[PDB]
């Protein structure tokens, strides 16, 4: 047992000192107090090349261990697989670990996520889709652990970007933010993951709510002055500004993956222009004429008809079309966010309404005094 440390004790400054402490913990037969420091043993190697040989020591203990916490065990195994890098047997290794961990709190979830990572740069049709859907064990989630939630969503965070559907990426990549992430990640990464998420926003088929992403407390705050075109464009979509979008194309950063979809992008903002145009109008008028819509979205008069139907088809506005006087009625524009001033105005409409209902109460109570009690 002690022989291994002899050849492994010459690995850096202070290395042999750590083992001597480690040996005593083994003698006492406890494992957890020996379990936490191993995590300190993964970041120790600058190259982390020889740390993969500790398997012989773990092999005896880990084979019939059933005493070390599997969550730590999957963490411990997953760290060793990092430098091992011969996947053929790692899967057997990774499958080997999976068969030995079935605790009440599923640690296989972390093991399954490790499976996909081993399949990272290979397969896109059914290589991982089979695993990820199966990985959805979260029924009986008992949320709060969330240790594996970050890993699962990250793994899913990479599938949908390798399949090209920039809609599920937003749906899941958002789930990662707000998980155990607790932000405070590498600032470069923080800005790195805001760009990727933001672009996914204005590239999807159902992502029309650019009111939460624009005010997302996490992502859109590590980008104030490094590349503001993405934040400016997000304000462009939330305001339904086609003019402010056609004059910013010249400032489109990372043109690939966003320049290819030049018509999908224009059909997204174009739809929102008819949206944050019904909102502005008071409910009384709401008589958007055909010309008044084409001008504000940069369409010809003979084409606005397909725009209104597109908005109604998705379910985002409600109304009817009258192609006799060239009018479009709107009755319900999907609610959006109001920061702090349109909410004060909402207070006014309740004061002017509570006082009106108040008056009609005493009117009946006073002229119906006999009929009461």
């Amino acid at each position: 047992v002690p022989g291994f440390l002899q050849q492994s004790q010459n690995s850096g400054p202070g290395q042999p000192a750590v083992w001597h402490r480690l040996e005593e913990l083994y003698t006492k037969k406890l494992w957890h107090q020996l379990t936490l420091q191993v995590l300190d043993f993964v970041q120790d190697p600058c190259f982390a090349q020889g740390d993969g040989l500790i398997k012989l020591y773990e092999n005896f203990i880990s084979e019939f261990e059933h005493r070390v916490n599997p969550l730590s065990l999957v963490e411990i195994i997953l760290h060793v697989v990092r430098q091992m890098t011969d996947p053929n047997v790692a899967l057997t290794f990774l499958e080997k670990t999976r068969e030995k961990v079935k605790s009440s709190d599923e640690a296989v979830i972390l093991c399954k996520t490790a499976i996909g990572a081993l399949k990272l740069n290979i397969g896109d049709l059914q290589v991982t889709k089979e695993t990820i859907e199966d990985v959805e064990e979260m029924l009986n989630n008992l949320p709060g652990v969330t240790s594996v939630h970050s890993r699962f969503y990250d793994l899913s965070s990479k599938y949908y970007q390798t399949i090209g559907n920039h809609a599920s990426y937003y749906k899941d990549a958002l789930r990662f933010l707000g998980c155990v992430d607790i932000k405070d990640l590498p600032v470069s990464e923080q800005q790195e993951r805001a760009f990727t998420l933001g672009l996914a926003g204005l590239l999807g088929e159902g992502v029309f709510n650019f009111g939460e992403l624009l005010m997302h407390p996490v992502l859109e705050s590590l980008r104030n002055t490094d590349r503001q075109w993405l934040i400016d464009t997000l304000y462009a979509f939330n305001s339904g500004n086609v003019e402010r979008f056609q004059t910013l194309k010249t400032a489109w950063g990372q043109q690939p993956d966003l320049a290819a979809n030049e018509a999908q992008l224009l059909r997204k903002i174009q739809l929102l222009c008819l949206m944050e145009m019904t909102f502005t109008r008071p409910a009384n008028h709401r008589q958007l004429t055909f010309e008044e819509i084409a001008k504000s979205a940069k369409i010809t008069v003979n084409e606005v008809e397909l725009l209104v139907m597109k908005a109604l088809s998705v379910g985002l506005v409600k109304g009817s079309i009258d192609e006799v006087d060239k009018r479009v009625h709107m009755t319900w524009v999907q609610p959006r966010v109001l920061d702090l001033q349109q909410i004060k105005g909402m207070k006014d409409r309740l004061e002017f309404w509570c006082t009106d209902v108040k008056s009609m109460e005493m009117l009946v109570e006073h002229q119906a005094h006999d009929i009461l009690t």
Binding site: H32, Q33, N69
Partner: protein
């Protein structure tokens, strides 16, 4: 005897499952209770025992009950997982005494401390402060090889017994595989 009611405070922390005594500190705990609950009974043929977990939050298994087998059977399926919240642990046992059977039973709770204890003093004095106000003496038994002598409870137990308040005492065990056995004798003997 003396119509006593004890409310056992079991431990199930994740680092509590290492077998530095013999059959891991899970059977070591189960044998420990057996030698107390039965010892707790057999003196007055009307006693009462209740096991409470010190897991992440309020986890109570069996309430005030004269039976003896329920606690033992309920001890199983108690596989340790998580941290220990001592400060908010005794109070949960504290309420159990308040809502007891016929109140003519003397109230005491024996602690089953273990995997690394967490406390900030000061508050612990308040924790011991209240219990010492209301006809309550606690029995924290040092176990699981916490910091030597556990010089955080030391400021705790003395508060209850302070001012010549003879009662329960702190009991420690050698870090070596010292079998639990009848080693627990300070409270049972006369306290």
């Amino acid at each position: 005897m003396v119509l006593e009611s004890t409310m056992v405070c079991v431990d199930n922390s994740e680092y509590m499952r290492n077998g530095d005594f013999l059959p891991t500190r899970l059977q070591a705990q189960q044998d420990a209770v057996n030698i107390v609950c039965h010892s707790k009974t057999r003196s007055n043929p009307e006693n009462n025992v209740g096991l409470i977990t010190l897991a992440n939050d309020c986890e109570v298994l069996t309430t005030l009950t004269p039976d003896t087998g329920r606690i033992l059977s309920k001890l199983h399926t108690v596989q340790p997982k998580g941290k220990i919240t001592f400060c908010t642990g005794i109070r949960v046992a504290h309420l159990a005494l308040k809502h007891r059977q016929g109140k003519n039973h003397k109230m005491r709770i024996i602690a089953f401390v273990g995997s690394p204890v967490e406390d900030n003093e000061k508050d612990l004095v308040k924790l011991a402060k209240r219990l010492k106000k209301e006809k309550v003496n606690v029995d924290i038994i040092n176990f699981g090889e916490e910091e030597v002598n556990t010089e955080k409870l030391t400021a705790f137990v003395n508060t209850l017994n302070g001012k010549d308040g003879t009662g329960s005492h702190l009991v420690t065990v050698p870090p070596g595989p010292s079998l639990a056995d009848a080693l627990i004798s300070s409270p049972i003997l006369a306290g």
